[PDB]
């Protein structure tokens, strides 16, 4: 789903009905645009991918009980039903996000956002109390960007590409920035439709309704929490599929997912999707897992020429120029295209978050202590929204698919992060050893995969021809912010700057 909203606009009917369409790709099933009674220079645009409640879930969500609340969100509130039941709320729709309205009316914004077990970016307008609220989930899984002017014009969107062509009177340049994960903002609505920020607030989770850490207890809890993470993510009336690369993380996801689909008596085969250059070791690993779990497996072969040819639109989708991110996004974009083209799988499970959470990257083998390693894991998790989780969202949403990432489950990730730092560093000499031991009695995946530790070259050779030595020598002059250090870096930056000239500070690093 793609959200777009303006408060305090000059003209949000004629010229900005057209700006709401820039993020259509995220939500192919339906579009609604509307303005606000009494505040007709404030408006919403919503592109829906209908995942829960096809008939009654169109947004802005507006229900009879709360005539002055307007909610637009991209997300999934996995614990909505148990809150609904505990508090005995009566829904008008059947959509998970309606819980946000009932909780807000009861307790305000802070006490609402801390209760949501899920992923989300939202905008909530309350015309009785004269407030606008922005919010984003803890790890930043679902995206949000914002722009605000001194006169009190506010514009928000799922992707920066829906903000950069807005023209506000008396601002020659509209500054666009990511909205920070794990924050809410409160803004005052003024009588003429402009807004003024009150506070931007970091929130933590609340309730919705050495001593210990023995290894058998830790492994048992991790199994249960991971299973729960996947189970709560079966919430959808659409077909669930799964990316399956043959790596440990996607394999554990695929295998646990199929087991949970069976327990729920789901009647469709699980479709799994791998992509690579043919005769890859990774593709054979993926096929091995597929046969072990019994999925309906699609193996997609990408061509060097196809990959290079996709860079332009991939960087357009991503809105960043980080080398690691751009490299990996080409394959994810192309597999997502294939999924949308060839199947009806819409809710796509993936393994992002695991490496950051479990200290799985090779360089963690060189960490000065368990506390310096633990700290680095915390920085990686805080920055996911710029990197791996940016890639995972932008490249699936580019083709009208919905990403789900169970490693970033709130209860599972919190429990793992609570573990003594010394149970989490590699003691045997293999990364993610605890994670592997957790699942070794399950027969969940083949033991060979459970214990396993030139697209890159083709990109080098291509950018070598596109960036000459003088361009590189001149790089600090042409690109003074986050200057590129390689020709690969330089090339991605040029593509980025052609789409988003002057926007390089979306990436801090
Ligand atoms: C596209 C999206 O965020 C889904 C919103 C809600 N869960 C739904 O309509 O399925
Ligand atoms: Cl998720």
Residue numbers in the entry: 1 to 209, 222 to 465, 479 to 534
Paper lines:
Asparagine synthetase (ASNS) catalyzes the ATP-dependent biosynthesis of L-asparagine in cells from l-aspartic acid using l-glutamine as a nitrogen source. Several recent findings provide evidence for connections between asparagine biosynthesis and human disease, raising the urgency for in-depth studies of human ASNS. As seen for the bacterial homolog, human ASNS is composed of two domains. Residues in the C-terminal (residues 203–560) synthetase domain (41.6% identity) are more conserved than those in the N-terminal (residues 1–202) glutaminase domain (33.9% identity) based on sequence comparisons of human ASNS and its homologs in a number of model organisms.
In order to determine the molecular basis for the binding selectivity of ASNS inhibitor 1 and to provide a firm basis for future, structure-based efforts to identify potent and selective ASNS inhibitors with simplified molecular scaffolds, we determined the high-resolution crystal structure of human ASNS by X-ray crystallography at 1.85 Å resolution. Conditions were then identified that gave a single crystal of the DON-modified enzyme, which diffracted to 1.85 Å resolution. Two molecules of DON-modified human ASNS were present in the asymmetric unit as a head-to-head dimer in which the two monomers were linked by a disulfide bond that likely forms during crystallization. A cis-proline (Pro-60) linkage is present in the human enzyme identical to that in the structure of the bacterial homolog AS-B. Electron density for the DON-modified Cys-1 side chain is clearly evident in each monomer. A hydrogen bond network, composed of the conserved residues Arg-48, Val-52, Asn-74, Gly-75, Glu-76, and Asp-96, which mediates substrate recognition and thioester stabilization in the hydrolysis reaction that produces ammonia, is also clearly defined. This substrate-binding pocket is located at the interface of the two domains and is within 5 Å of an absolutely conserved glutamate residue (Glu-414) in the C-terminal domain. After refinement of the protein and ligands, a single 12 σ peak remained in a pocket at the interface of the N- and C-terminal domains on both chains. The site is surrounded by Tyr-78, Arg-416, Arg-245, and Val-417, and the peak was assigned as a chloride anion. Importantly for structure-based inhibitor discovery, the synthetase site in the C-terminal domain, which is composed of sixteen α-helices and five β-strands, is well resolved. We also observed density consistent with a bound HEPES molecule from the crystallization buffer in this domain, which hydrogen bonds to the Asp-334 side chain and water molecules in a network that also involves conserved residues Asp-400 and Arg-403.
